[PDB]
Design an enzyme around this catalytic site. Structure first.
Site: not given
Ligand SMILES: [Zn+2]
Ligand SMILES: CNS(=O)(=O)Nc1nccc(Cc2c(C)c3ccc(Oc4ncccn4)cc3oc2=O)c1F
Ligand SMILES: [Zn+2]
Lengths: 410, 224, 293, 220
Positions: A100, A139, A142-143, A248
């Site tokens: 792990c 979000s 605008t570009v 963002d």
């Molecule tokens: Zn482990």
């Protein structure tokens, strides 16, 4: 018959008896899920009240239960950047799990100390700013592809006539944020404030990571799926060494070119955001809801962001990065995603991850998506464990094999 | 002699000084006597990291060759061979140790299973590294009689059987390239262990479980 | 008796439209209006854009044609949709009243004498959707209720595509939430949700005040905390009849066990009382919007 | 060939066996040629691991050596076997340093690192050495740091990585070895505040956190 759910909502009706605990009885169906009865949690409801494993079925008859998750330690001495993961110090010598990938110091579970590591105005004016064409949305803006001695970009936004004291801070936001010179970040030519307010950036070919992972779905292998976790954490360490929260982080904003060069943009802007409807910093939930922490969805603080809420926004671009689907892609709703993400009832299911995903990551991507904020690792470590197993991939390019013994003594 | 040579490995394991405890466990089992379980696994523990590290290195060393003229390409070739010679000799040390002393003196069943299990595993490392067919075949035989004797004595959840089943499955796919044979035996050992997973020994409780999840990780990787 | 027809239209492409103006600024999608030279009749142009897999996008457009058989004077008719400009163009009937989002923002308030008439139309327009098509609205909000100055009120924007229900569910942000507790707690009980989504919507008409912050703004998440943690809101009295409270309070209970079925919502006296008294709706809006005939 | 030497280490640079390249970096400059940056970087990284592997082996067996007596006595000769290699491995660089590296420094950053490298390698011997040779070795690094530390101020930036690396190493030498924490904590802050006042960047910041991480520990 005592029905129990499983991760991925799977169902199994374990037998109902008396005198023998759930542990080994459930372990059968559990272990085809690869879940030791020492690491998981099961619930009895009279919301979700956990119960352990030493419970006889006599009191549990006719009840529905869930199955939810809550180490062989060799020694080692680490010969490159290795950060402990129980107190997040720097690790030179100390344990490491075989499978792990989780390292820690026994001390933190006449003594020595630390040392060195193993080394290795100026605003775009109007007129010349060639306003581009229809490009799209996002979000908050605008570009606009600009044409002035090269390739640039123009943005629009949602505050029209701000107070004079707002605009002078805008000259200071760029001063904080025009100094971002990097290889993972596109250049910032400035902005145009004589026209409607803008944030001028560059333009890149190819597309973002959302297009590569939801439209074409040209899913890569770990040689590239861990390089991307590298050339995006590095671009989010320089962004946080000098304290500019991206705020963002979207798979739609990670614009990589030629599938080699990785570039990041569309960040910052605490003045355009935090709308000055009066003269306050009242921020608003504009955009998606997956790349947002529980406390950024909640907005229960005046400024609930952090460098941690840029890390819960890194697991979502990582839990997207491995599976190939998008998080919370099954709930046919909007406000149900917002309620649970904000509340803490539900989190993205890690069962849908790939079958060949390295177990060393299961302690990394799970941290970058933890419910709380005082747990997820900061960005220098993210670039550490992703440099670590970006080259440890040829070592683990095979199938499995029988591992070593315990070697752990307490 | 043995008592000191047990400690000298219990002091070279802790400090990751493997080549010392590779050359001191060889000196406690050429005593010609039987091995109890204590120094038993340390003998495997010692070589596994010693023989593995160059395999863990040769995997990394050869991959860079797979990450590539006539000068740069050459430079890995001599160095990868220098790993081969180091890896070939360390493999032969246990094989000579296994054939001459260990296997003939293997008094108990699971011990007899164990040392045969090493033998195929060791030729497997030469198989991956590398006429060449004798290496892969002798591993298959050494596994084959290892598996056949495993079916009789031990309870069917023993780590050695599953470890062999997990080991023997990998030899089927990564050299012979016959995953369907690998998938079935991995499935068979995994699935059979399900029913027999009654109350289980606490000592092997942890070790067997660690193996089984790896088997599914082989299966779930092998399903595609 | 209403004689609704949509056979006049022909092929639909962007070059065959010339824009006129904009109906208004919506929340999820922005509503326009345009002129089509062949058909001539004015249309409502609802442009929502989804950057999605074209196969998924194509799977939805073909399913948008089932709106043809969901024809009635209670639900807005469907002129036809097509893919172009990279955007999805859900053309709709152009109704001169926009929705009752503008009405509240213009008229300030709506009296009880009107709610009785509209509650008749929706409760049967929803019934037209369930008992015939086996699907329900799922989007019961005032701005999805197109109205006009012809004395008619109608619904629009139900769930026509289960794919675009989710493909837009991560694009319909909004700020007001009327979704039922059963649709937010983590399961689906669609049979009773739309009643709540209508029960809360009407309170936004009777009083005109968004009741989630109780009368006697909150963060976009904070509203849902009210919706699914504490007892529901209730309509003010005095200016509203007590027997009207017998209607709304039966539509705004959390637990669907206490919720009255749709059939129970026509056996009540008040629902059969609203239609007993007539209301003019031709000169009602024309005296508050400035439109004529 | 210089190309062959630099390449051969890089094939073992990531192979986790670090003795092999440490045994070929000696041949890199036993000729005494001029050192560029990257090779000089490869020279440094080797013996820190080889000593560190030995130090980490030295550290643990000392705990057994400090654990206790029939069993414990086996460690001492085993322990003395480690430094005998470790002293020999380190002294190879000090011989290399005092024959081809230190007397051939050219630039401002050349002289500062090697002296700190010389001091730390003396410190590694100073970790274990005892008797009359203990303080003799410890002393020879007092000037080794001091020579470079006073060159750091006048010749290279407050945020240039070597000074923070030198200051961190110079500071840590005072507490664990010299038993002088007060000269250390009051000394880290000087170098800590010097870079943050006038604050290629990742290496810089990790030393910075270590400086603060050590200052907190030194105040414990
Ligand atoms: Zn482990
Ligand atoms: C908000 N609640 S939700 O149920 O989770 N999501 C949605 N619910 C409903 C709907 C949608 C999305 C959606 C829209 C926007 C739509 C718009 C016009 C339309 O055409 C039309 N024509 C005639 C009559 C009525 N409509 C059909 C439409 O079908 C849809 O599925 C949800 F996304
Ligand atoms: Zn720790």
């Amino acid at each position: 018959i005592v029905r129990v759910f499983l991760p991925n909502k799977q169902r199994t009706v374990v037998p109902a008896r008396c005198g023998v605990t759930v542990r080994d009885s459930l372990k059968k169906a559990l272990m085809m899920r690869g879940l030791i009865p020492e690491c998981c949690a099961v619930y009895r409801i009279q919301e979700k009240k956990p119960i352990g494993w030493d419970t006889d079925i006599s009191w549990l008859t006719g009840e529905e239960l869930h199955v939810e998750v809550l180490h062989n330690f060799v020694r080692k001495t680490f010969f490159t950047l290795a950060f402990c993961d129980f107190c997040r110090k720097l690790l030179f010598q100390g344990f490491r799990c075989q499978t792990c990938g989780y390292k820690f110091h026994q001390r933190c579970s006449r003594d020595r100390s630390s040392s060195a590591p193993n080394v290795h105005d100026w605003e775009i004016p109007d007129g010349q700013i060639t306003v581009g064409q229809r490009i799209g949305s996002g979000s908050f803006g605008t570009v606009y592809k600009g044409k002035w001695h090269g390739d640039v970009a123009v943005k629009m936004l949602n505050v029209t006539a701000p107070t004079p004291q707002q605009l002078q801070a805008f000259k200071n936001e760029v001063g904080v944020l025009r100094k971002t010179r990097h290889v993972n970040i596109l250049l910032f030519m400035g902005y145009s404030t004589k026209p409607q307010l803008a944030i001028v950036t560059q333009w890149c070919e190819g597309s973002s990571l959302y297009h590569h992972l939801h439209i074409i779905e040209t899913k890569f292998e770990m040689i590239k799926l861990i390089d991307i976790a590298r050339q995006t954490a590095q671009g989010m360490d320089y962004l946080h060494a000098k304290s500019i929260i991206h705020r963002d982080l979207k798979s739609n904003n990670i614009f990589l070119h030629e599938d080699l060069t990785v570039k990041i943009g569309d960040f910052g802007l605490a003045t355009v955001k935090s709308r000055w409807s009066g003269s306050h910093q009242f921020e608003q939930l504009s955009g998606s809801i997956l790349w947002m922490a529980p406390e950024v969805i909640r907005m229960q603080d005046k400024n609930p962001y952090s460098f941690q809420s840029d890390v819960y926004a890194f697991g979502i671009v990582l839990y997207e990065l491995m599976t190939g689907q998008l998080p919370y892609s099954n709930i046919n709703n909007r406000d149900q995603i917002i309620f649970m993400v904000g509340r803490g009832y539900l989190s993205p299911d890690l069962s849908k991850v790939r079958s060949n995903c390295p177990k060393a990551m299961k302690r990394l991507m799970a941290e970058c998506l933890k419910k709380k904020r005082d747990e997820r690792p900061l960005f220098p470590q993210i670039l550490a464990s992703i440099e670590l197993l970006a080259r440890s991939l040829p070592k683990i390019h095979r199938s499995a094999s029988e591992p070593s013994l315990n070697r752990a003594g307490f | 002699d043995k008592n000191e040579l047990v400690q000298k490995a219990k002091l070279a394991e802790q400090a990751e000084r493997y080549d010392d405890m590779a050359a001191c466990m060889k000196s406690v089992t050429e005593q010609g006597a039987e091995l109890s379980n204590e120094e038993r696994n340390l003998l495997s523990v010692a070589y596994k990291n010693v023989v593995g590290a160059r395999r863990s290195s040769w995997r990394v060393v050869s991959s860079i060759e797979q990450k590539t003229a006539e000068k740069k390409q050459q430079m890995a070739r001599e160095y990868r061979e220098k790993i081969e010679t180091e890896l070939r000799d360390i493999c032969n040390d246990v094989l000579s140790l296994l054939e001459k002393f260990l296997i003939p003196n293997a008094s108990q069943a699971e011990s007899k299973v164990f040392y045969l299990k090493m033998k195929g595993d060791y030729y497997r490392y030469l198989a991956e590294v590398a006429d060449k067919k004798g290496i892969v075949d002798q591993s298959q035989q050494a596994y084959q009689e290892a598996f056949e004797i495993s079916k009789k004595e031990m309870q069917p959840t023993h780590p050695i059987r599953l470890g062999l089943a997990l080991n023997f499955s990998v030899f089927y796919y990564e050299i012979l390239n016959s995953p369907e044979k690998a998938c079935s035996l991995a499935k068979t050992a995994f699935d059979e262990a399900i029913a027999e997973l009654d109350t289980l020994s606490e000592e092997s409780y942890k070790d067997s479980t660690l193996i089984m999840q790896l088997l599914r990780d082989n299966l779930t990787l092998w399903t595609s | 008796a209403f004689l609704t027809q949509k056979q006049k239209v022909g092929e639909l492409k962007d070059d065959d439209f010339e824009k006129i103006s904009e109906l208004g600024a919506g929340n999820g999608g922005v509503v326009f209006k345009v002129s089509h030279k062949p058909s001539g009749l004015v249309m409502a142009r609802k442009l929502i854009h989804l950057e999605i897999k074209p196969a998924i996008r194509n799977q939805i457009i073909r399913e948008l044609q089932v709106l043809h058989e969901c024809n009635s004077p209670y639900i807005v008719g469907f002129y036809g949709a097509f893919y172009s400009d990279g955007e999805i163009s859900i053309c709709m009937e152009h109704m001169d009243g926009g929705s009752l989002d503008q009405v509240l923002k213009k008229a300030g308030r709506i009296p009880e004498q009107i709610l009785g008439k509209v509650s008749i139309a929706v409760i049967k327009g929803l019934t037209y959707l369930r008992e015939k098509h086996k699907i329900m609205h799922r989007d019961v909000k005032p701005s999805n209720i197109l109205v006009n100055s012809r004395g008619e009120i109608k619904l629009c924007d139900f769930g026509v595509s289960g794919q675009l229900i989710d493909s837009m569910a991560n694009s319909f942000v909004g700020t007001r939430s009327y979704m039922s507790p059963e649709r937010l707690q983590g399961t689906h009980y669609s049979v009773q949700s739309d009643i709540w989504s209508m029960g809360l919507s009407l309170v936004e008409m009777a009083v005109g005040r968004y009741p989630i912050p109780p009368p006697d703004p909150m963060a976009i998440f904070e509203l849902l905390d009210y919706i699914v943690n504490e007892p529901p809101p209730k309509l003010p009295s005095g200016v509203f009849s007590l027997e009207f409270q017998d209607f709304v309070n039966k539509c705004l209970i959390k637990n669907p066990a206490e919720r009255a079925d749709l059939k129970q919502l026509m056996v009540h006296a008040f629902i059969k009382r609203s239609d007993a008294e007539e209301v003019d709706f031709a000169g009602w809006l024309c005296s508050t919007i400035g439109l004529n005939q």
